[PDB]
Amino acid sequence: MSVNVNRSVSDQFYRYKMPRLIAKVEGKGNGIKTVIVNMVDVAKALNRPPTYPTKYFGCELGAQTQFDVKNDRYIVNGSHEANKLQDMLDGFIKKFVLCPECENPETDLHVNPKKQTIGNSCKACGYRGMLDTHHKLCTFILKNPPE
Amino acid sequence: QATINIGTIGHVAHGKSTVVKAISGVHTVRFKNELERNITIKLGYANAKIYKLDDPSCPRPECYRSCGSSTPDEFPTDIPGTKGNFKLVRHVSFVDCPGHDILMATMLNGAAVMDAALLLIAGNESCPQPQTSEHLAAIEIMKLKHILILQNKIDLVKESQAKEQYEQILAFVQGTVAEGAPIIPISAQLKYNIEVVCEYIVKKIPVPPRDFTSEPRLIVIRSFDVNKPGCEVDDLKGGVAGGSILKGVLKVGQEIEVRPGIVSKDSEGKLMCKPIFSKIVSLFAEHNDLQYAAPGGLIGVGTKIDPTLCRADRMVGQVLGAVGALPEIFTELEISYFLLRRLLGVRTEGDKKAAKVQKLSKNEVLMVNIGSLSTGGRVSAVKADLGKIVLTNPVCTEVGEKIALSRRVEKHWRLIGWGQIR
Amino acid sequence: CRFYQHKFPEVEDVVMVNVRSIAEMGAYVSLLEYNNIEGMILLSELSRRRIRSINKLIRIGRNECVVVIRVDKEKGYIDLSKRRVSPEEAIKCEDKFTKSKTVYSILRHVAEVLEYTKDEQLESLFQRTAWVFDDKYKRPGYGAYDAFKHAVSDPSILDSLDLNEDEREVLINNINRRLTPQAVKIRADIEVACYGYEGIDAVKEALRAGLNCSTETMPIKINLIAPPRYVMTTTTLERTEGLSVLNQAMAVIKEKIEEKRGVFNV
RNA sequence: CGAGAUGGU
RNA sequence: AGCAGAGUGGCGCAGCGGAAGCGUGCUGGGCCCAUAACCCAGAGGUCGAUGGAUCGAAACCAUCCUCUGCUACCA
């Protein structure tokens, strides 16, 4: 299987396409993990560091997240099988990088970590601005600027 | 060598591989560690023969059946004759012209090295297809009237939509070219009717005049094959130029030169640029080596140069001749010009900025073409019909009769008109 | 058998060992460079910080690096420690052990001559040649492995003493079967692309002028990553000596086209 | 002064 | 074509010239009233062809084979 990057658009010819995101449920009750297997390839296909899309699930779900250089596992704590992610797999696009003028997420970020500001720019119609101040992930991005 | 050379010309999304194989037996290609797309996007070739039996048909190299291989579920077949002995009509080879308007300079060069055009048509976009003016208006301005039309990808298209295509084209050409080019229909998947293309390249196209004894002239476009293996790593074979001889007999050991050559290092500008010259080391045509050559045919010419010039087509659109030849070399240009009556390149159900071209200004860079070359032109002085410019690389011609002009009217240059030297 | 000059280890240096059992006060161990003699590591000497399980610091049959903290010569008692050992000293211990295991693998096989009835022949073959070849060098830090490497390039080392033919050939083979890939260790990188319209004749000097006064038979090896990135091998010399030939070759490669009306970055 | 969360019948 | 990896003993990561190598996954047992954390033990075994030193060859060294990786070309 393969998919469009976002499911709010039903078009077969939509500009954005990517591999599936698949995960393992591991352990037993009071200590369950969900580990995301494709995360480095999905982060490469979306042109972002793999910390940002992993951190967004913990911000929405109300859950802990882990990262590890010794084992390369990316983890969201608790059981999040099937619909518990797959109803909202669009979200890292749908709550950040859709343009309000047109539904075309051909979109870039630049971080000014010395001055508490994240700049945003979409190629599709020239839309520019910043990320939202009520939204969760802004406090993580300013402490973790892009490569 | 050859008697005539034919340019296969078209637009995006019309295909290439099946029809270029059908007229020649050869797959047009460029080597890359990557998938083959719908088009060969940049100028190429296909080597060929045209032959018959005693009765009109185009056989396979085994003469008894025309049996196909382009579709997995069927074997379309006919008998040209009961294993009859084949007869060659004439020696021919194909110029595989660019598949996209992005390469329009290289397309005008391809249309100048051919003696005649095949123009290719397909059902994949709306009826009034615009390249039917864009090629043929320039081809008439470079005085090459020899034209044919070939309707390729129509395997699932009804006869009324195939009509509406050629009839809206027949209405559209009224301001840009004469209607007098025959149309041949084929199937792209089944190889149906393809031998009528072979018959029409005998029926429509004449052998053109050339001087066999006047001073040598050659056009070069291609970096021909040189390969990595060797016990000596530099200069084992030397660089080979692919081209077509315009004028004069040619021989091995003759000194030959390229007119625009190169700008000398440590020069402060356009001064001290010079021709480049050497003895011809070998010759190639029709899958044979040669000692001698003639005007009017595609040929490979061997030279002493570094193969690092040949690992890509650096040699696109160059004019060559005998060492110390007369024809004037231009690094700056005096111009007079005229612009097209519509903006051109693509079309749909109604107007998309198709109005007349806005006048030129000095704060801009043109792409400008002469003979079978190309260069970038920067303005010293201009008016809406006339100007004076300086060139990012030199160019040459035997007479200043014509130029073709392209402007940055959007992100990449489009043709907007033509002109002459003053 | 013993691998070294002396009957017992010296204090405050590192030995290679193998673990045999674990008890209430410590682990019992056999030293490998000595003839399997007994010593022990106390449980207080395993770590600077709290131990979650002992089985993941030590388990039976694994080889290990430790210091000798105390010795009594008369009773044959040796105390060992692991808290002390730095990772550089563990690498140094593996080098001493590898240089010793290779020499011992020669001498144990060379001993399979004459009657070979007892370990007396092993101790007699260890004495004289192999012992006088490194007793002189204990302070500089060499072992008989270096004397064997000298005996490979010139057998006059062996001719200086009473000798056997296995002791000559097995010694040489346990170096040469590993040393014979004396492979290429320098190549040049050059950015040159050639201006010369006579190149198919003229560049055949630049391909061949790279060293003076050779035989007519002398080869060189030439390579290419891509056409503008020319590469050459410096007469198969090692990286300790070929640096002069590297600097000369790249100068000659540019000279034999700058002599011929070319110009390039120096 | 090592680490010591949680709760269908 | 230059340089590098792989060729399971258990998914997956590929150690070092000693017959699993360690962090991890799977399966079972202990501890607790019980679940997680923690602790311990299991898994039928020449790892593509042809030569050579060894107590020994997936892992010391030649010569062939094939696909990837980065460069980037006999096509």
Alpha-carbon distance of A49 to C20, in angstroms, equals: 50
**Beta carbons within 8 Å of B422's beta carbon, 6+ residues apart:** B334, B335, B336, B386
User: Which helix (H) or strand (E) covers residue B149, if one does?
Assistant: strand B147-151
Q: Distance between the two ends of chain A, CA-based, in angstroms?
A: 30
Task: Give burial (CB, 10 Å; 0-12/13-18/19+) of B326.
Answer: exposed
B305/chain C closest Cα distance in angstroms: 6
Backbone phi and psi for residue A145, each to the nearest 5 degrees, phi listed first? -65, 150
B281 in reach of chain C (CB within 8 A) = yes
Beta carbons of B303 and B320 less than 8 angstroms apart: no
φ/ψ region of C113 (left if φ > 0, alpha if ψ in -120 to 50, else beta) reads beta
CA-based radius of gyration for chain B? 22
- Number of residues in chain B: 422
What's CA A74's distance to the chain center, in Å?
Answer: 13
DSSP state of B105: H
Sign of the four-CA dihedral A134, A138, A142, A143: positive
Contacts of B114 (CB under 8 A, 6+ apart): B5, B6, B7, B95, B97, B144
Distance of alpha carbon C95 from alpha carbon C115, whole angstroms = 34
Question: What is the distance in angstroms between the Cα of C200 and the nearest Cα belonging to chain B?
Answer: 5
Taken as a whole, chain C contains a residue count of 266
Instruction: Characterize B180-201 residue by residue with b for buried, 16 or more Cβ atoms within 10 angstroms of its Cβ, and e for exposed.
Output: ebebbbbbbbebeebbbbbbbb
Could you tell me how many CB contacts below 8 A there are between chain B and chain C? 50
For residue B373, count CB atoms less than 10 angstroms from its CB and return exposed for 0-12, middle for 13-18, buried for 19 or more: buried
Estimate the crossing angle of helix C165-179 against helix C87-110, to 10 degrees: 140
**Nearest nt (C1') from A28 Cα:** E36
How far, CA to CA in Å, does A36 sit from each of A26, A97, B95, B208, C50? 11, 22, 53, 69, 34
Q: How was this structure determined?
A: cryo-EM
Q: How many CA atoms lie within 13 A of B382 on its CB side?
A: 17
Could you give the CA distance from residue C206 to residue B102 in angstroms, rounded to a whole number?
Answer: 42
Give the mutation candidate from B233, B266, B274, B277 for the C interface (greatest C CB count, under 10 A).
B233
- Residue among C200, C224, C228 whose CB faces B235 most closely: C200
Q: Which two tokens stand for residue C162?
A: 């009473």
Question: CA quadruple B45, B46, B48, B52: dihedral positive or negative?
Answer: negative
Q: E strands within B171-328?
A: 183-185, 217-223, 240-247, 250-251, 255-263, 273-279, 282-285, 288-290, 292-293, 298-302, 318-322
The answer to whether the beta carbons of residues B372 and B317 sit under 8 Å apart is yes
Strand, coil or helix: what is B380? strand
CB B139 within 8 A of CB B149: no
Instruction: Determine contact, residues C189/C157, Cβ cutoff 8 Å.
Output: no
For residue C240, give every residue at least 6 positions away whose Cβ sits within 8 Å of its Cβ, in sequence order, or none: none
Give the SS3 label for residue B293: strand
Please check whether residue B388 is in contact with residue B334, taking contact to mean a CB–CB distance below 8 angstroms: yes
Residue B311 with chain C: CB contacts under 8 Å: 226-227
Which residues of B, range 227-256, sit inside 8 Å of C by Cβ?
228, 232-235, 237-238
Strands lying side by side in the sheet with A74-77: A23-26, A33-36, A74-77, A65-67
Q: Name the helix (H) or strand (E) containing C40.
A: strand C38-42
Residues A5 and C202: their CA atoms lie apart, in Å, by 59
Are B216 and B322 in contact, with CB atoms under 8 Å apart?
Answer: yes
Helix (H, G, I), strand (E, B) or coil at C136: helix
B263 interfaces chain C, CB cutoff of 8 Å: no
Name which of B232, B265, B305 is nearest C197 (Cβ-Cβ). Answer: B305
Task: Tell me whether B349 touches chain C (CB under 8 Å).
Answer: no
**Integer distance in angstroms from CA C104 to C1' E70?**
43
A38 Cβ contact partners less than 8 Å away, ≥ 6 residues apart: A19, A20, A21, A22
Determine phi and psi for C179, rounding to 5 degrees. -85, -25
The Cα–Cα gap between C236 and C181 comes to 12
